[model samples]
Target chain A: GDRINTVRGPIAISEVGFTLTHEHICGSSAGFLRAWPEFFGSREALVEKAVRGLRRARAAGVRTIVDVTTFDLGRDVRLLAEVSRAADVHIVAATGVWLDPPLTIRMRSVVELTQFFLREIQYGIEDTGIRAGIIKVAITGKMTPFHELVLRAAARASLATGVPVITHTAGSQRGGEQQAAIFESEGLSPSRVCIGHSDETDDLSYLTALAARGYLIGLDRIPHSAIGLEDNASATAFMGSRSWQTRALLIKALIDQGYMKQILVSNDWLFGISSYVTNFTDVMDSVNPDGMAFIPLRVIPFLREKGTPQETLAGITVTNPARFLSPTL
Target chain B: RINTVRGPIAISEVGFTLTHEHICGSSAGFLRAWPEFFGSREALVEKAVRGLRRARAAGVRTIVDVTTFDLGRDVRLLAEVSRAADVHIVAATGVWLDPPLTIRMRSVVELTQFFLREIQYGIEDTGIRAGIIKVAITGKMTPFHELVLRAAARASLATGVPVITHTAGSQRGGEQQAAIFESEGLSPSRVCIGHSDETDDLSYLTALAARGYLIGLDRIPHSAIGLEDNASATAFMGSRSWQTRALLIKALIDQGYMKQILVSNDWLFGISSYVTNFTDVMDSVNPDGMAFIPLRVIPFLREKGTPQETLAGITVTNPARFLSPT
Candidate 1:
């Protein structure tokens, strides 16, 4: 009887197997994309490239992906629904804003913003029948008044809609604690929130604190290099990089602390952005060339070698996400 | 001569330092929109005088003002505040994340050349040579963020002035920042990674220190932008809690990083069109003001068994060494 919202429509929660908690089919500044189409190539070509990447992820045993691209970060629900159909994979779209919101969104009061987010969650986004599965908000460095306002609005919307709240935190600020504090103030249970991009940090104490408080930790952004390398090798050639090693160890540390269920894993990979290729060559050339395959093909096998159990991997890659994404929750 | 805004001072004369603090900061966007909202200049100057007097009373002889142009930096106000408060204020030149249009249009080399001029020939013909250079990065280092960072590095290399950075901290961009600076031939000892105190990861902090970079456990009072509604009730819950900050500082000290650590409040006393009710805001959120480290955090650390000598090293020696000509 439980169901979850996917790009196609509502699907049985059980159907949402082997889910990647955080991912992106396309992520860039939507304003920039529109203003300079030449930088990103034709939309048809970009969607076609995304279709191939999603199909590859499906072949690698990933059934569902929570596409976390928000408005500021270029969320295209129509194209995502098209990709889901083309790749035969369930895609969960998001409705919220990313960091550095435009003045139009930022100037609105919390009540006004909550209504906008609620519409995307309950009703469809921009006349499309596809509903958002999660509410995403981003924070960088310290929490500004605007950051707190948006976060509190997202919290209220999540409580009203029963959709989960996920965040893009600037990990060093321990923004998870700040988010938890704001959510607590809003009376939202920690279980309904996922603190994202946490894999960038190896502070087990901070991660453990959040997990103990019932928050899901997103160990996303696998294979992201902490130390930038020169442009000599292909992106895939640097797969299972040093950052990956640190992440695997962090996962092991979290699991060893008996917080396995609180862990969620994925590659926060962005596919088919041509400008990213020109500007972020280090990313296109060395971090995510293998796309969704980076996790199942690279990180999972690598974690297993580091003594991670198969059941734990299943919890992170499958069961936990289902529990987190289930509508009944 | 090592020039400060108050004129040249011997490096040894800079004592019991608070490495980073701001007398006034405003956003360029807001100021450009509403020039009338800045309030009376006399009122702004008096408030800064009171705040800095509290800091000086607590034995802070020198402070570094790392405010950049985007942050509504007013060097004239800073000079006035320095004279009124009787504390040596070192002015900085660089850019924050929202760089000016002129800077945005230029190449990294052009940007680097501009910063070199600010440090060597003095900023904007004010005859006030910058004592430090600053650069900021939001989320992950974007291509633009990397360009600014590399430019800051090159500027520091040319001027031999120390560099301080504003990091998203949570993204762990500090490591990449260190790598870039080192690659540009800037010694680790010549750079201070600002906001390193935002995290409790001893491994990361120690690693930066291992390479000789000074760590800023700045933002001592946990004062920041949000949580304005329940300022008093939820102060401890936010990551800016004095307890959270103190634990990170104590951990680094226990790891023998006392000598490489610099402590400051990063307190902003005034900003024109923005933060007009500066005094009231401070009272509601962080009443200790500039005395946050000396009055509250230090007492807490001493209770936790940190020796006075170690405290002196963080508050005094480390910063002096960091700012001295390399």
Candidate 2:
């Protein structure tokens, strides 16, 4: 009965199969560019690599992927559409600001910012007709007044269009609490927000508290270092990596404690352009060499070995994304 | 160089000023409807006259009524009140919080013209021009609120009149509003952040003042300390109320922002039950309406060793300098 926006067009909620809740197919334009017109490295080369990565993810049974890249990331929706079409995957695009909002965007009034996001959701992004399925916001450090304005703008846009909000939070500082308070003040229900990058912290209580508040927790930074040690192949060789075990047990605790429907799992992975920013998996290449398919290829098997039921894992991969992304009535 | 409602006054005559106050009817109180006027014209005039007389008696010679047009700014009433009470009153012209759709639909250019008209020409043909342009914001700053803010900024730029702003104290909205004004090319010296005492974040308060904007500790309320007829009679040190505000104010003075600090009791005669009979104008809780700062705040500060010279500098010298047209 409900349709979710994707790069191709709208699709039925059920048509969304195994989904990746947060991942990026492009690098930041501001970060990687030599200047305005010139990219530091090859734009074409990055897209080619992204297409290859998504193809691997699609083959690994990932039917849908939410590309949570924002405008600040130098996200080209046209290239994203081409990659989605090429890889034969459903790619849901994003509409919102990232952690470091530019002065031009942050300077905008809440009404103007809300209109910008709503226009992208109702009409299209850059005339591409690729409607954004979700609104994305972020906080990297202490919340500023400008950040609060953008959060309210995103909250209003979500409330108006019935789309879910995805947040990139500094999980250690528990910035998600401030983000949630802003959304709650705007009268948007917690059920419609996904607190992303939750796996970055070993504080399972942060995840548990947000999940308890009816917010869907995105254990999306899979294979990222959470313990004191690093995530290298050397660490994973003896069964699984330390971070992987921590996350599987986190998932087990969440699922076992009545939050089965509130968890959507993926990797907060992105295909960075070069050394200017962290390239995809170049930091933890051995721990997650498969990029977007790291969860399905390596981590899922690790979790299965750690005693998480196959049915519950399927619910995390498939059902949760479908449910969180279903348009509100 | 001071633009008082009674026309231009010499800087020397603009004695100890309450940088923010509202003699208008109880709009900040529980307003059941608009035009919340008193029973008659004399009642309104007499209420304001009595309040300002108390203030003038306490050595407050000038008052900036940051009450905007939407808050029922009647400049003629200000003329009458100032004339009757002998206190210099600077009138304001702008909107508050979220304005009505009529104002919201106006283009920024359109809104700028409206403010300039009031600032230069006069308020609704009274020939009494607004001395200061005021804009207040609460909650999230909306597009219309920004529109009005930019208009105030624009009008201030065009006329050289200073801009005063009422902000949600707890939200620290002044920082954002100051950002917008700076974008509009207005100097921080040409602005005042109002209702600042509502928050106790010393750094937040000091940072804006240090940037050259006058920090308005303007919302001093009747705290737990009882007035003679206080109904609650619950005298306790309000760590979160006026006591905390006192500490912040003293801290600002100690940190060298005395020149950028402005004080007043945002004492509206009709601010709900805090002052029960606004027209008659004093409840047991707030027996001194506009005079609360000088009568109560000053004595307390005096006991705490705040020098009289610094008090005069904050109450008079600073405001005279602030209201002086550049």
Candidate 3:
């Protein structure tokens, strides 16, 4: 049994079936619900909204979901536990901050922040005793001091604990190189990291280099048009209007390069969205009818028609997640 | 005399105030670049006048437009809306959220002079001076956010026009902002930490109120649509939100902080964050517009056995004391 912490407790890595690697069960601007609960409706309601999707994913053969929601993005370990229990799906919770580090994060030393991450991984998040399974960190635009501090902190925790790291980088800048370079200096193996949102760019030179260096490339953000609607070039490029079609091609190219094991696929779907709108599901329902299952239900089928074999797709969907999430030991 | 967008007026005339309402608050300077998306300026003015008139009828005599240039603060638009609605509209001078590259590239000293000019000589050549200084830094004060924040502080010190700040609601940046204000040797009394009601953390609100800063229970949405994420809707939704906001006001009043309290809707003709009809000046779910405070919130406060005096001051005297330049 390759042991790893799920919100439910330690579980064998093989028990994790089809997985959505980088997705959020619920999210908002940091601390939004506590400050403004009315707009957030109710915690129970939000939990159920996520559970509904979790059950759908489970029914469609998804045994586990790695919620990359950190504390800042309204990550609720208790709620994650509740939904995991309710949906009968294993949830591997994450620990770290999103792009904007709060004052506490900014003021604290890198060593101090690393311990904060370490404690959460070792002890529990807050007082709940639900240990984090992975360290998730993000970067936006240029890497500010706080951004670098957080990346280093994430790297430190990974080195000490044998836990794998998931990094959020601007795909347009192909920031995976910079992120990977930081990890390399910190003595983290590229194999221990999954460069998330890797499909946001079609730059093979960037993607192949990360794969060649033994990093997992996440082909998340499948249906970009349904989400990244702004004039952001990164949003519209490979993942926007063409979305899964282009992503499928990118996946094919990576697979053709004998980097099949390095590819991970997901929609980066947010169940309860952060920014304003009636509902993200409502907004995206017409655009992306399948929700979380879009990768398997839609993208996989299209990929099958593209002459890719099913067992090979299974390696990307099932076995790869199992291997990436397995403890380094 | 106190500055309103139209001209100077007696401080007493600034009655029944909504301390932070935006006639326009769009993203990344879209109010200028993509005015067509929000509809015509005349349409926005008409909507503003309509909302202000309704607010006026509901006993709201003045509105503190905390919109900065980044948020598409058009002083001339405020001038026309005030004249048409016959309501005192206090204009503001400062940056909102993060500054644009054009702004951040400029020095803080340069930004300060521009803000000072807006307060003293008026916005553009229209000769309508801003009454208050406004600035925002959501979380983790970045270099550029600090630049504009200090610039606003410098302008506030140069001119006694009070300062208002936008903070992360649940995360609570009021203390951080108040620290910056104090660092500049600016009095806590001169600053109003806006959006304090976004969370029910009374300790955060109480601490700031005790420090002599005005606690803004602003951004009180008439419906759940006001959330940064509209998907978080609950059973009671907007009513529950209003009830909770009223609770904050009453608790502050009980704590003898009625004097340091300010309230508003943070309403605007268009909010880019949310999906709303172009013509609708308020939330799609909430038709209260500028009248939300006096029409919805005050009535709720009064129903809960809050003293008539405190209720009167929350919408009037508390704002009047802060808005009046020292």
Candidate 4:
């Protein structure tokens, strides 16, 4: 009944199974890569590393991965297409901007930004002819003027293209509600939006409320924890151990609450080289080696031990992601 | 014995107890840093006594006054407030986030012994034994946070007094706090995780409850911290809306975790000037205060289909169990 736009071109929605809804094959600052190529390593090396990670994910039963690396996060369509072909996995590339927008893009009006996003969705991202299947929006603690403009633009573009909107949310701030509020104002269906990083908090009232309102809840950062620039020292201490258990407990509770269909799980893993100056290596090393296999290997078994039915796991891991990623007419 | 400042009372008498609250709480820094601005201690005591009377009028029989030493816990003032309001006020003996030199210099075992003495005899010769041990952590636990938590756990073990804690709900530190207490051989049933209401994360709260810890939905009416009120486009944390609090409580009750729950105001009646102004800001938005649960939340829950027995279990039975001498 539906098809999804992937880096390999359109495929039946049924072809996407056990999908990881938000992930990054290669994430770096494009500006920095263009400015300083040596720092990020060669494009060939980065593409090779990403292909290995995708193959590993596919071997572990991840049939599709939504590469949510956006403009500032170095959304490399050509590299993504290379990884998809090499790894033999359906890779869906995203079209949007990350939080740090260059001055030129930031200064543009909402209409202009919406046009830019639509161009990528309809035509292709940066002439690679790899059409974006999802719209990405990033929101910090609270929505700033720029965040609101980006959110509005993303919503407007989603409305224009029939593609789904996904978000990078500050879960502590309940940023999803603000994004949903903006999308609601734009007359976009909540069904077309996935609030990411929601697994960061165990706030069931917040999660279930969004799910009840028809928004897809991204419990996507499974078993992955490393301090980010956005994280405070306080959050850092608890994030390492508390995040994984809390995510598991949250999924069990969400399933118990019967919101399994609205839940999408993934690693949000940044696999390849980054051009941005970050503690990416340190973060990757700090995370559990089995982080990529957390859902199928650890989380599913843990949930089963906790009495979460197999079908519920399938719904979150397989059925839900397929439906969420499918294009809506 | 669970000693109330009103003299020793049986734990069973602690009916409908507000598990964690402050009859009068001011930062020691504020008192020392700007003494002239901190109105006379007597005037502060009067305001606290009035607030206590309102709580008493709303049917709160007992309150665990968790005003730690760092938070300007005036035992004499609390005694007077408890007497004037005719409420059983259980005072605490412990340190908050910023421990003084006397406490900071002491070893963890030394601090544990000091707290044991306070529970065994009295706090600084006031002849009023402390009923609970208080520990407060902001965000993550440093070595200092761990030291204080372990000391509180040891003190609770030595005295059979329950340990109540203040957690930065956003940091999800309650889970770690429970782990520390359990590691120290203190049972979770004898511990109450306070300020947990700040997050809507039911799984975290439920996990703690499953471990036998009492969850504090204290800090009701402080709306800037919890949920977003979609219609008003404002946070329900610092707002007067008890809707979020009621909804969380209702969810917990529905999930059958009623026995492991305790509710309180966490109300600081006489705090620093900044807090007074903060309260004023919250008041202008949501006038629900110390009497919020009894006056509004219960009614709201009842309307939302919470049975009278469930409400009683939360307000009356649970506190009695949590506070009862182990």
Candidate 5:
């Protein structure tokens, strides 16, 4: 069994099975949770929900998952450690900050901010013995100067530790351009950066441009209207029609451009939602799609019909993220 | 001298030397000039042919045009036209600026293969070969651009051809570009930095010259385009010096840079309206037209401070040293 590091604590976790690029064990109610108070109210509910979800994930052929939920949003290391112990699946956690309007106070300085995040990864948080496996950073709206600074710092830290830096980019018209400028400025190679949630925008040129820079484009967020479904069935239908179509077009274009190696697919799932929360027996059980496990059920079959190779599927779903989460090794 | 055709039309004007021209490409115009139907081959060929005829009448015997791979600019037809019309045509094989095109191209090894194939085919089968390799390195001391420069240098060394480069206006001033090429084993004298005149600042231009590259003051326009103060200052400075290189060289030249300076019109065939066609069959050749007859600017340089011997050297000798023997 290979050991996975979590921000909450380190746990002896097993690997060697199908891996999901993204799956969540815990989440918060706030749309942009940056403070302790906003996160505390949901902590107990999310931790218990995540613990159960982790176990369910283990049983369903998912041996590893990189939970991208950032700090101060019910991303408690202790809770993730407990969940890892109960689930037995390799749970790789993150360090870094999420994007927002009012910047988080903790992200004010490049040096101090990076050090704080790195220290958490270095010395497992709160004696729960968890350390960050990868770094995550987010951008809000158009790339303002502040966001560029944060991106630079995250890239520097990634360079320092040889861990990959995942970006949460606002899916806007300027997402690719903004990300390109940031990475270009830092002298960091784009192969190590994942521009997460690029599907919000429907611009093929933007995606192609990002791919040309050699960065991995994240096709997270299951198919659904920008609006949500009242229940799982409706959501699954939304996925088949909307998200599936967009992702298909993007994938086709990528293949034509000879850039399949630059793709990474995921659900970007945030657990603790009611449907999976109450029914799943454990963390592994929660891995089921609310409508259908979006990555496994919808994307995989569509990609198969489109003639995507199994090796590619494994790379996007497994090896690619593993490289990002543990690049040096 | 060599003969070449840009589009489908055959042009036979004599003494032709196309300093700056493009035979085929699929870029900016695809998005910006679509309304004019620039994407269609008929329209593209029509525009290109008209430009080619104008060059023919201007007494131009040859053309050295650059269109790298991703620009969707190929020279196969151009070579065929050259065969039929007897015009000297020199195409380019190398890298381009910006990530989109260069990044999408084949890997370094693959690009070297493409260049070798094009050169070998042009020489053996088609009777025209790429005269020089074109590479672009930005001013920003970027490692990516540096990598590309190194790759171009390798191509130069392997093919035994000189390298002509387009640099980002400001980034042209630094040594990084030349340094990268040198690190890849290219002699500094074999590299020509075009658009040195666009950067009037002496420090930058001189620094590049110091690196043993041919400083290309290609665009000496009739008037400056924008930035009133800079334009006026440049003109006043040039008039004070009569666009002379002697004093300019003295101020900027470090060691061994005087002989390295070369000048050209940097004129594009169709894009600008500054040139006039010569033949009544075509149009009037302009002040900046590249055709040798009527001797618009090239003659002006001859009449100005440049020695007749050096004038011949600049137009033919210097260019020959960098291009031929490959």
Candidate 6:
């Protein structure tokens, strides 16, 4: 018996078929532009591209994709639904804010801002039939007043929504400890949150401690630059190796240590967006080299080479997304 | 206007205020919490009183007693010692390590509220608001650790109190700690990267310092425990002209920080059986006793080569500024 009720209408968690856990059908900044009449007059152009990407992903066998975008960075649901229909792929979404000065700049106080975040998830975006599948939180560099406020908001939102949380960690040593302290302080359940981008940290002991709390460790980064004299993709090709092989080792270790259920993978794509900011106009041209854009081609193949069992891959891509997306899986 | 010199120079402009120093109670010993090993408050108070007496003797005026909720660190006794001994004592609020010394906290927000409450009570009732916030993370950057750091960053920002961390050794030192604090949205100056000296990488320490973090170079001479004693020795050896030039370079980093470098003795009293008790008054005593003064062997670097102004910063002014509400 699951307490899954359609907030507005039934949500889909694509199962069994090829699943891409991470991919963006539409962009936040793009939505922000379309929302305003001036920056970009018509939403039609962005929607068209999003539809095309979705269609491409669908043709490639991706049945389910979770678009982990939050509200503060221009979340638009009407666009999301249309993209979902066009892509023919089940899309699960997020309810939260991005980690930046601009996000905090909007609110008079984080407490007030958190209340706004809570309302968004409780009430689906603009009466469209999609409620947030997860809550999100982020950090910039180190502990600051703004971050504290964001945590307060996220904790409150999670308590209210009962949805799993997706957090973006600052890459470096403190990510694990920082996340744990915040979660422990807020009294939030670690099982429901996935600490994003944890693969960047080099230490295994650190990963193990985080898993001890039941939060999923994300091994989602696909190597972009070349390694040694061997090019990244080429180096990976040699041993049938993928950078994610080490990640698989990490995951296997965690799994051996009994943290199997607490791992998830998703690429935090910047694609046309450079250095995690500054959006580019030509999405197609931006999709090539030096761009580890959305579309799970690299991740899936890498996971396969990394010894991820076919069935497990199916779950991470399929069952896991479903468990997280569906009101009832 | 700015003082830039070469070598491990005496921390002349240190403005050294002991950021995370312990006074009376056993800091980590309580984490060992077996009944047989349990430390009594009376014993802790005696140790602290003795330690405070030593601090008074040494002209040390301000110390931040960063032991917060449920750690068995008696803040009231510490405050009493402050009142009696006339040294400024800063209290802290937050969670620390796991196991017997763990914080059974509910959530980050709850912890924030707890810190707020502590600040409120300390300021209002005890006339001593929490001068800072404290949290510790193992060197390995784990998911939960990241979350906790984010929470600590959040709490620090919420309270407007600088955050002090108990960072473990070399494995996850420089960038990782910086990244987590930054990701959590903490300002670098508001954060102190503790135990930066655990590794021999002097450049890493400088990098963190450049980013506005106060590098903690406290824990010295605990060789039996496996912590390298070389950080200080390395500092001594790296510099040429200034004798204490390396130490001065670190001090300059602090001075460049304007008011960020925090030096303290992480002294744990009532537990170090290596030293003789004062009641016995034996001349045959370990030079570095369990008392904070004796424990502060190197921090009293002022006595060796540190310049007076720098010593003031490390012992008085900087700590006062750190603990000050501003």
Using TM-score as the yardstick, the better of models 2 and 3 is 3
Q: If both were scored by DockQ, which would come out higher, candidate 3 or candidate 6?
A: 3
Winner on lDDT between 1 and 4 is: 1
Tens-digit per-residue lDDT, A5-42, candidate 1: 88899999889999988988876543233322333465
lDDT, candidate 6, B146-190, per-residue tens:
655676777677766777777774464557868878877778878
Tens digits of lDDT, candidate 3, A1-329: 25879999988877888988887776654433332233446666777777887788777777888889876565767778988999999999998767544333455568767877887788877557788888998886877787778888988898888888998876466888888888888888888899998887889988999999999998888866634565544334423555568776899889888999999888777667544333444555556766777777788888888888899999999999888888773
lDDT tens string, model 2, B93-198?
Answer: 7766424323444678867876787778766546677788889887788887788889999999999888888876347899889999999999999999987877
- Top candidate on DockQ is 3
i-RMSD of all predictions: 11.7, 21.3, 17.7, 24.3, 25.5, 23.3
Across B1-326, the per-residue lDDT of candidate 4 in tens digits comes to: 46888689876777777878876555432332222233655666676677777777888888888876556566777788889888888988887865543355457876787677668877644778888889888776788788888999888887788888888735678988988888889999989888778777889888888888888888776755333443222432444445776688888888789998888777765545232234444445445456666887888889999899988889888877776668
Candidate 3 docks with a DockQ of 0.02
Error of 6 at A269 (Å): 2.9
**Per-residue alpha-carbon lDDT of candidate 3 for residues B160-210, written as tens digits (9 for 90 to 100):** 999998876338777777777788889888999987877778998898888
lDDT of 4 by residue, A1-329 (tens): 25888999999887888888888876564422332233336556666767776787778887888989776565667778888999999989888877655433454568867877887788777546778999988877767888888889988998887899999886467888778888899999999999988888778999999999999998877776543533544335424445576777888788889888888887777765343323354456466566455667778888899998888888888888777777774
Poorest 10 consecutive residues by lDDT, candidate 1 chain B: B28-37
Model 2 docking grade: incorrect
TM-scores for every predicted model: 0.50, 0.48, 0.53, 0.48, 0.43, 0.43
lDDT computed for candidate 2: 0.74
**Candidate 6: segments with Cα more than 4 A from true spot:** A1-8, A12-22, A26-31, A35-43, A101-111, A127-129, A223-258, A270-296, A325-329, B1-326
Q: What is the DockQ of candidate 6?
A: 0.01
Report the Cα lDDT for residue A206, model 5: 82
Segments in model 4 whose C-alpha atoms lie over 4 Å from true places: A226-241, A273-279, B1-326
The true-versus-predicted C-alpha distance at residue B259 of model 5, in Å, is: 5.5
Question: TM-score per model for chain B alone?
Answer: 0.90, 0.88, 0.90, 0.89, 0.69, 0.70
DockQ of each: 0.01, 0.01, 0.02, 0.01, 0.01, 0.01
What DockQ results for candidate 1?
0.01
Model 1, position A254: C-alpha lDDT score: 89
